[PDB]
């Protein structure tokens, strides 16, 4: 009954099916990217059906299946988060890296190990899937640290060249520079608002002081590069076109953004943060578009291009209009 | 072959061997420490018709 | 071995204390007591000091 | 404790006839197995020190190494019994003979007992 | 299967000393400076030029490419630093001052 | 479903509206719900049944242990150690049972705020007030007290707030 | 790396002690052999022990 | 091999105290952990004062 | 107890009658037989304890060490056959004798239920170390990491000896059941200050702390792959164990009186994190990383909160896993390369990939990565410490950005790049070398599963 959970539970279960089959026979053969590719254009199609729904009705929902552990008062399960910004961001996410993937299977027919590009794809859409649909901060921490490890991991496709590694331990390190303040965050929660679930964090915090938001936005600076740890983004071009294609360019470098938007309650309490957080992105943006204004290697300019993005959607999460910036996003 | 393995393999029973003895030994030293068997004011209960002892 | 640690009897105590709550919070909603007591030890058990400063 | 001194002492006597007034060691006491360890470590050590197959050299000189490791383990461990249960004795007899230097305490329940509570934060 | 005079020693004061030292490197005896003889422990290892590994001759066939290293030069105290992955000192097309200026 | 008590775990009726469809064109809503529910809910329900007629013809029960109440630490004597240790563990069980509870308020807060969407500041209030009560009393209870916590750090520390108490109310009257 | 772990936190604990003990044992340690200083030795705290502990 | 014997190795043989050495290792080995027990005793002084004056708002701090 | 410790005493008659080509199997064998019988002691209970007797007893903190130590001593057996190759059988048979000796001495360390009995077998546990440290050493600096494991720790423990027996006297009684009952609190004053002092470094020596860490990068160096495995994995553990263990009787001193250490820990382990990334060494390199882990747990343990003694089991378990597997890899890359240094070998993903995915599995956990138990021990640590003080975070922040740094770098440094041109002996991987790390890395992957039994008691 309401076909809504299990839909979007098994869209997120089929993404992993070839990751299990990683270790069969298929594996060996060229017939891998084909399959990979069908699996992905199965669960966006599969994934299509919630978004109706949500549509027709207004569907929200949570679903809360595992319970991982018990803390004294504080409980952690597995708990997904259903509403309008998942149900909708998971249907672009799948198209983009359904087309990607279709384009990867001519860009890099003459890889010797396409195979294993293909699966760490998959393995870096899983874990934005897991990120996106996060409902308990410790989940989007999972997933937020997973995309980061992937990007690594895809940055420095061609381990002889050393800029690729370069590039790669850069980007780690800016992200890591954000993890400083997510850690500082979801610490903050944990010990005034006495949960790390959404819901709870909601509630509790009519007006929510300075240091989690501040937290947060440093959190969104480092995984959105803002001006501050920007040129890990343009740098990040090293890798293979279809990786800065999907990851750098459209789907893992909106995860900061994505960020600020699902603590949307607690933003709009607070007037300083948006403030600084308006700053930025007008700074962030403009500095982009200037440096990519006399650019001669089209990735970089595009990778500019990128970046004064997002800071125009972080610009709009300063004006209070949240919503506006999932569009655009 | 039968009494050929065993001046080879006798080795490997003596693990097993003292799992059994520690075993025995642990219920031998816990036989000593039954001074409030049935006696403990929250587990106090009264013994069924065929039981003599709460637990061993 | 993991299979044999992932099903230990729940010796913890985690289901039996689950339960224990339901019962309380719901003899305390019934009767209107003020759910959790802010004193853990009645007051008539414990003699204070009598100061007289 | 210094018994040294002890009243009613024979000088030069291993075990008191009062001694025999107290449980022996049983044979398969723990100790006593010890002692047999111990013996068989020496027959061992002997066994290597003068280059011979260790374990199966002399059977004769092994069993009497156990053997007498055995016999002075019984022993000791009935006079180290025996001393205990003295210095036992001697401490409860002087208690109840001073009762005005071990007064009875004066039982109280933690109720009212004011002890300092120190926050941990 | 190094000899105890091939591993380095104290600060040299003699020149006979500073040239067996100068040797042992496999440098040119006036091409070989120590560090200055202060408290740090230095000792009698060559100070070669602050000069990083990403400028080095990348057309020159080098016995390890990826390091821009010969087999058997002396190796700079501080080649952790410079290996292409770290900090490199290749000259700017804008002078130091002027990009720290305009940054700011 | 009857797994679970109703009146611990509070939920509302929830009214839902009725279809009135507006034009002729086909939702695909519709559709595509009976076809879900066609090919999937029924070998779904049909598995079910047969392993719930599996578990019908070998029944047996577990039941929950009930514990006897023992003498606090507050009728405990200075050195009395097996009073000490009952109290101590009926304590230690007491402050398992109190999180428990607390878990109990917390899940229903977290449902409130959920189900209610857009309006969640106004329509959970007394869940709210609820968790405020609670949590204030876990607080006087159990904070602070350590990570070597115990029966006795319990009730010096409710001594020490009772004498606190017992002083303010004092100055309070006599001013 | 240099300065603190491998330079001073080596000369404060280990390498004082074991200078401090190396010295300590060349004093005592070097004796002639000689009774004269023995003796001598001797009747110092002799002296010493029956004027000072009592 | 002279490398890794002369980073590891032939520091302390070499080692002498002197004014700037001394300096240093003064500095540098005690001033950061001076500097951040003077930071953390200000501020758990400032938050027990606060606590004893009861101006905190540390409602919902159950866990600790 | 004694079905475990039975067992471990009978395998030194197994080793010393086996065949000349058979002891490795049956040790092997029968070692991870007792690894899964003394899997049982994972079922605690939220109540006191399992009180087996007089003598041993089991708490939720004392399983997952005890279960720890039991399981390695099979990846030590696997990780010492290949360099004992050309070695004597009686010489092979000793070395035997002393890693069981060390895992009997852990073992009745570990329960202990009386304090100078912990003391006792917690002092015999090093003998059999330092007979291992400077005998089957392969460098000439053996005799010296020897010396100074000897005696830095002797040092520090033999003032616990007069404190323990001073607290026997005045006390009574030194198990561990009557002092956490009849605890009372100890008054500010120079004596209970000393008694701290004496009561609190012969544990802190032993972790180490930073500034007394001298010791362990020279005998994690100096010593086989054996050693290096049991002193990074649980010999570490000891020291935290203990400070648990005895931090009940001393408060409210330690409110105050932690302050020197929780400063030396919090700027030691940025120190020897940013020392990580000069190295021109790997064992040391993975020594300080060990030094630093070690001295968050210090932290964590200092703090005295509950989420603090959570966060500091989980850390402790899983830093002992990690270091281990790494001390692994460093030692498989070493018996081929015959140097043991960081760039002499570049580019091993390409001649060896499955040993390059080990490396990276390896990095990542050391990394704290989600949702590996070590992310769990260091969030928790670092939720109490925030408690703690609001301005803890940017030291933990800075640590975690350089452990990041420096894992990365030692992955990329001996992984990618190009391989070096004058080696031609790397053969391909065993399949011992393949199965001593899966069996390392596998245990980690199952526990961040269900987690609750590695939480300690506080859970
Ligand atoms: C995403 C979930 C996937 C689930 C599907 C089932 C997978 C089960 C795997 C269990 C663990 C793997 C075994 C470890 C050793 C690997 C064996 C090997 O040698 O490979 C050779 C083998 C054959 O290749 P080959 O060509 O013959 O050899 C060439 C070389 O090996 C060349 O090698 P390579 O180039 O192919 O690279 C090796 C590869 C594979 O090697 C590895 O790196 C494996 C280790 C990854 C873990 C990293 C440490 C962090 C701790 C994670 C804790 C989670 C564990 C949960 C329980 C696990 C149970 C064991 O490395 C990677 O792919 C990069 C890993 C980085 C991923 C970062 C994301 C982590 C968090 C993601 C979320 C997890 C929880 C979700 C919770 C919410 C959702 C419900 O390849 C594989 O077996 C690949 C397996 C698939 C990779 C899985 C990695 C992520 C999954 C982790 C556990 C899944 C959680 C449960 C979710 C279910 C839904
Ligand atoms: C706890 C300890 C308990 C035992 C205490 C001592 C007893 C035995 C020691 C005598 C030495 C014998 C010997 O050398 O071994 C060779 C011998 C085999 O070789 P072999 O061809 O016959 O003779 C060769 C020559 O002996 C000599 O061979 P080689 O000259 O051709 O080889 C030269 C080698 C030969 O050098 C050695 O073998 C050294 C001898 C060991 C030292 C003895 C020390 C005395 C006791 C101290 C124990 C300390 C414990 C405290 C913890 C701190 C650890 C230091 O020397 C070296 O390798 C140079 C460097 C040495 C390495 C570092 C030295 C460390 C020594 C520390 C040992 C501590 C643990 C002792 C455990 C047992 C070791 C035998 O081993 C044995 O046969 C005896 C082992 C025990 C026999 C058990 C049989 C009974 C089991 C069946 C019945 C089941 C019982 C339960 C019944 C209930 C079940 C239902
Ligand atoms: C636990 C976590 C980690 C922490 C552990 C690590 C860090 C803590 C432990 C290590 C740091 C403690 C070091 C402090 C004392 C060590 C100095 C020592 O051992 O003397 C050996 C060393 C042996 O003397 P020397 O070999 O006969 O003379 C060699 C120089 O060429 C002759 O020098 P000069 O004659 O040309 O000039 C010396 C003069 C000139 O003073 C200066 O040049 C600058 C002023 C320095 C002190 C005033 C501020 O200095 C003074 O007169 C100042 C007296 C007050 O003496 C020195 O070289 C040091 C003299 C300067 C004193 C500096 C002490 C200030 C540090 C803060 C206290
Ligand atoms: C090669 C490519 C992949 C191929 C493989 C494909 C298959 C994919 C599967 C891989 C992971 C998918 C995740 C699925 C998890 C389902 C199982 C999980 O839910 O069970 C866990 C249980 O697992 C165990 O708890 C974890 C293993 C225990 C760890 C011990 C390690 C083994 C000993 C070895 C030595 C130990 C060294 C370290 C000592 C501390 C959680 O238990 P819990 O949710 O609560 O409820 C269990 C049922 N109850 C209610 C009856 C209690
Ligand atoms: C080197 C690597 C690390 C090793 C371990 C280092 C940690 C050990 C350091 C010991 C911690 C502090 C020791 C004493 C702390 C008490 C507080 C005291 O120091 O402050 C004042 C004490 O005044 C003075 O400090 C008196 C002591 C001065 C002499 C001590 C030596 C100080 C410098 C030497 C440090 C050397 C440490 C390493 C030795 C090798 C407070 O004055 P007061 O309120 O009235 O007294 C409070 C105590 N009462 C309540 C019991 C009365
Ligand atoms: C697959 C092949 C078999 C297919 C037939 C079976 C289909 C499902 C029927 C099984 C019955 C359901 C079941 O498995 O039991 C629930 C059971 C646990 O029992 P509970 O009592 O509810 O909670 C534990 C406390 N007692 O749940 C499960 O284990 C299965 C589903 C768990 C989710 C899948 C695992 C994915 C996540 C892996 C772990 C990742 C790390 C932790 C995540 C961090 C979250 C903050
Ligand atoms: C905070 C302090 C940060 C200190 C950083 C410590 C790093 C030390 C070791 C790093 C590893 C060295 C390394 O990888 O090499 C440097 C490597 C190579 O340079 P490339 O440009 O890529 O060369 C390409 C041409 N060949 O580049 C880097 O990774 C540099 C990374 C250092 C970044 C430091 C600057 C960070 C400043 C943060 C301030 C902004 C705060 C946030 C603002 C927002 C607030 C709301
Ligand atoms: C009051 C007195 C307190 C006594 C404390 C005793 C501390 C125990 C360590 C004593 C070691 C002293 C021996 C020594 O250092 O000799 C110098 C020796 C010379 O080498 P040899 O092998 O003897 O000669 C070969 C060439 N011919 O120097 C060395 O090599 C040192 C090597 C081992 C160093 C070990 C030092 C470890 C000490 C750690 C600190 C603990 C100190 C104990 C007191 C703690 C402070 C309260
Ligand atoms: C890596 C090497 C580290 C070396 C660590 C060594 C330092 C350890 C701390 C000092 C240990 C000695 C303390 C003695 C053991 C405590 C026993 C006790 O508590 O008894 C006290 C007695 O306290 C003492 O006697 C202490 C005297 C100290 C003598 C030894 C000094 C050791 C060095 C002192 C400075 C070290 C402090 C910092 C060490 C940092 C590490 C270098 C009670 O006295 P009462 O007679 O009962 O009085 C009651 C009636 N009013």
Redesign the pocket.
């Known amino acids: 009954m309401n076909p809504f959970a299990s839909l979007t539970l098994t869209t997120?279960?089929i993404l992993?099916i070839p990751?299990?089959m990683?270790?069969s026979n298929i594996?060996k053969t060229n017939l891998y990217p084909n399959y990979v590719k069908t699996t992905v254009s199965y669960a966006f199609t599969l994934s299509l059906v919630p978004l109706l729904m949500f549509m027709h009705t207004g569907q929200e929902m949570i679903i809360s299946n595992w319970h991982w552990m018990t803390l004294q008062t504080v409980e952690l399960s597995?708990s997904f988060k259903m509403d309008y910004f998942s149900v909708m961001f998971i249907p672009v996410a799948l198209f983009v890296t359904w087309s990607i993937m279709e384009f990867s299977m001519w860009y890099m027919h003459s890889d010797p190990?396409i195979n294993?590009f293909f699966?760490?794809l998959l393995?870096f859409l899983?874990?934005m899937m897991?990120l996106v649909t996060a409902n308990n901060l410790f989940?989007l921490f999972?997933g937020w640290?997973?995309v980061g490890?992937?990007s690594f991991?895809l940055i420095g496709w061609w381990h002889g060249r050393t800029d690729a590694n370069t590039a790669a331990l850069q980007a780690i390190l800016y992200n890591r520079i954000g993890d400083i303040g997510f850690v500082l965050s979801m610490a903050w929660f944990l010990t005034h608002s006495n949960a790390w679930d959404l819901q709870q964090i909601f509630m509790l915090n009519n007006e929510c002081p300075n240091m989690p938001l501040i937290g947060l936005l440093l959190a969104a600076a480092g995984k959105s590069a803002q001006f501050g740890l920007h040129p890990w983004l343009p740098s990040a071009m090293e890798g293979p076109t279809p990786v800065s294609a999907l990851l750098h360019s459209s789907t893992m470098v909106v995860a900061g953004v994505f960020l600020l938007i699902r603590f949307y309650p607690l933003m709009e309490t607070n007037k300083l943060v948006q403030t600084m957080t308006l700053c930025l992105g007008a700074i962030t943006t403009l500095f982009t578009a200037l440096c990519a204004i006399t650019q001669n290697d089209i990735k970089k300019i595009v990778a500019f291009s990128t970046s004064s993005q997002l800071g125009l959607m972080m610009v709009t999460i300063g004006i209070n209009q949240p919503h506006l910036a999932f569009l655009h996003i | 072959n039968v009494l050929q393995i065993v001046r080879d393999h006798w080795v490997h029973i003596l693990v097993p061997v003292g799992f059994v003895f520690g075993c025995y030994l642990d219920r031998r030293s816990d036989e000593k420490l039954t001074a409030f068997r049935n006696k403990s004011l929250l587990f106090k209960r009264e013994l069924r018709p065929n039981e003599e002892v709460t637990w061993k | 071995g993991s299979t044999f640690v992932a099903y230990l009897p729940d010796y913890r105590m985690q289901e039996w204390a689950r339960r224990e709550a339901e019962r309380l919070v719901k003899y305390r909603e019934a009767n209107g007591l003020p759910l959790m007591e802010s004193n853990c030890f009645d007051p008539n058990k414990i003699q204070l000091p009598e100061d007289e400063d | 404790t210094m018994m040294s001194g002890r009243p009613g002492r024979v000088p030069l006597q291993f075990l008191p006839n009062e001694a025999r007034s107290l449980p022996p060691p049983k044979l398969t006491d723990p100790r006593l197995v010890y002692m047999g360890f111990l013996g068989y470590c020496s027959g061992l050590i002997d066994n290597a020190i003068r280059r011979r197959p260790v374990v199966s050299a002399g059977l004769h000189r092994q069993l009497l190494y156990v053997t007498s490791f055995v016999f002075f383990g019984y022993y000791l461990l009935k006079r180290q019994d025996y001393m205990y249960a003295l210095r036992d004795h001697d401490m409860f007899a002087y208690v109840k003979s001073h009762p005005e230097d071990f007064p009875e305490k004066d039982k109280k329940t933690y109720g009212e007992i004011l002890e300092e509570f120190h926050p941990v934060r | 299967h190094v000899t105890k005079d091939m591993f380095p020693g104290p600060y040299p004061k003699t020149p006979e000393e500073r040239a067996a030292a100068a040797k042992k490197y496999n440098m040119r005896v006036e091409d070989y400076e120590p560090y200055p003889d202060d408290g740090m422990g230095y000792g009698d290892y060559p100070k070669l030029p602050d000069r990083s590994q990403q400028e080095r001759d990348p057309w020159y066939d080098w016995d390890h490419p990826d390091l821009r290293l010969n087999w058997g030069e002396p190796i700079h105290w501080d080649l952790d630093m410079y290996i292409r992955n770290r900090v490199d000192t290749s000259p700017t097309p804008v002078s130091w001052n002027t990009m720290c200026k305009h940054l700011f | 479903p009857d797994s679970w008590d109703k009146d611990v775990y509070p939920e509302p009726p929830r009214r839902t509206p009725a279809p009135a469809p507006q034009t002729s064109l086909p939702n695909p809503v519709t559709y595509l719900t009976k076809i879900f529910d066609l090919l999937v809910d029924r070998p779904v329900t049909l598995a079910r049944e047969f392993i719930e007629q599996q578990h019908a013809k070998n029944r047996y029960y577990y039941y929950h242990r009930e514990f006897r109440r023992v003498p606090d630490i507050t009728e405990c004597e200075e050195k009395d150690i097996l009073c000490m240790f009952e109290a101590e563990m009926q304590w230690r069980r007491d402050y398992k049972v109190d999180q428990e509870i607390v878990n109990i308020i917390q899940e229903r807060l977290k449902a409130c705020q959920q189900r209610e969407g857009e309006s969640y500041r106004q329509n959970c209030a007394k869940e709210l007030e609820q968790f405020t009560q609670v949590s204030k009393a876990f607080q006087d209870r159990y904070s602070d007290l350590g990570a070597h916590y115990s029966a006795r750090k319990c009730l010096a520390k409710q001594k020490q707030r009772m004498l606190a108490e017992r002083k303010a109310a004092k100055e309070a009257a006599a001013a | 790396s240099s300065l603190l772990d491998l330079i001073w936190l080596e000369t404060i604990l280990p390498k004082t002690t074991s200078f401090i003990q190396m010295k300590m044992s060349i004093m005592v340690s070097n004796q002639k052999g000689l009774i004269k200083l023995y003796f001598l030795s001797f009747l110092i705290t002799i002296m010493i022990s029956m004027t000072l502990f009592n | 091999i002279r490398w890794t014997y002369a980073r590891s190795a032939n520091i302390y043989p070499n080692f002498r105290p002197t004014p700037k050495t001394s300096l240093l290792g003064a500095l540098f080995g005690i001033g950061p952990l001076f500097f951040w027990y003077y930071v953390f005793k200000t501020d758990r002084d400032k938050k027990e004062k606060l606590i004893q004056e009861g101006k905190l708002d540390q409602t919902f701090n159950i866990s600790y | 107890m004694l079905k475990i410790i039975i067992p471990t005493t009978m395998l030194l008659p197994m080793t010393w009658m086996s065949k000349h080509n058979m002891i490795w199997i049956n040790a092997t064998v029968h070692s991870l037989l007792i690894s899964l019988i003394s899997l049982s002691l994972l079922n605690q209970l939220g109540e006191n304890s399992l009180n087996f007797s007089l003598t041993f007893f089991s708490d939720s903190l004392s399983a997952p060490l005890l279960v720890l130590t039991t399981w390695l001593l099979p990846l030590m057996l696997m990780a010492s056959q290949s360099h004992l190759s050309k070695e004597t059988t009686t010489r092979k048979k000793l070395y035997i004798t002393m890693l069981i000796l060390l895992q009997l001495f852990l073992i009745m360390t570990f329960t202990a239920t009386e304090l100078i009995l912990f003391y006792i077998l917690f002092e015999a546990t090093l003998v059999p170390t330092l007979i291992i440290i400077t005998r089957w050493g392969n460098q000439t600096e053996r005799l010296n990491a020897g010396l100074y494991f000897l005696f830095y720790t002797l040092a520090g423990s033999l003032p616990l000896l007069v404190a323990l027996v001073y607290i026997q006297n005045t006390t009574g009684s030194l198990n561990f059941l009557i002092i956490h009952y009849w605890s009372h609190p100890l008054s500010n004053s120079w004596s209970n200050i000393f008694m701290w002092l004496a009561c609190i470094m012969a544990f802190m020596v032993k972790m180490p702390l930073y500034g007394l860490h001298l010791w362990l990068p020279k005998a994690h160096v100096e010593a086989p792959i054996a050693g290096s495995m049991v002193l990074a994995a649980v010999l570490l553990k000891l020291g935290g164990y203990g400070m648990m263990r005895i931090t009940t009787i001393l408060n409210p001193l330690t409110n105050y009186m932690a302050y020197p250490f929780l400063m030396l820990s919090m700027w030691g382990m940025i120190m020897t994190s940013s020392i990580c990334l000069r190295q021109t060494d790997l064992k040391s390199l993975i020594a300080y990383s060990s030094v630093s882990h070690m001295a968050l747990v210090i932290v964590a343990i200092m703090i005295q909160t509950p989420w603090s003694f959570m966060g500091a089991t989980a850390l402790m378990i899983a830093h002992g896993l990690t270091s281990s597997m790494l001390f692994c890899l460093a030692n498989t890359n070493y018996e081929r390369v015959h140097s043991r240094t960081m760039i002499l070998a570049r580019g091993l993903q390409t001649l060896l990939?499955?040993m390059?995915?080990?490396w990276?599995?390896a990095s990542?956990?050391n990394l704290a990565?989600?949702?590996?138990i070590n992310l769990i021990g260091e969030l928790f640590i670092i939720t109490a410490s925030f408690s703690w003080s609001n301005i803890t975070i940017i030291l933990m922040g800075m640590n975690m950005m350089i452990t990041a740094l420096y894992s990365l770098y030692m992955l990329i440094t001996t992984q990618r790049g190009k391989y070096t041109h004058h080696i031609n002996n790397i053969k391909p991987s065993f399949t011992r070398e393949n199965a001593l790390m899966?069996l390392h890395?596998?245990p980690?992957?199952?526990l961040?599963?269900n987690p609750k039994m590695i939480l300690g008691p506080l859970y």
């Open positions: 997120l279960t992993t990751i299990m990683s270790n594996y597995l190990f294993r699966k760490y393995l899983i874990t897991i989940q999972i640290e997973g490890i992937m991991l | 990939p499955l390059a995915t080990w990276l599995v990542l956990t990565l989600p949702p590996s899966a890395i596998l980690l992957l199952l961040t599963l």
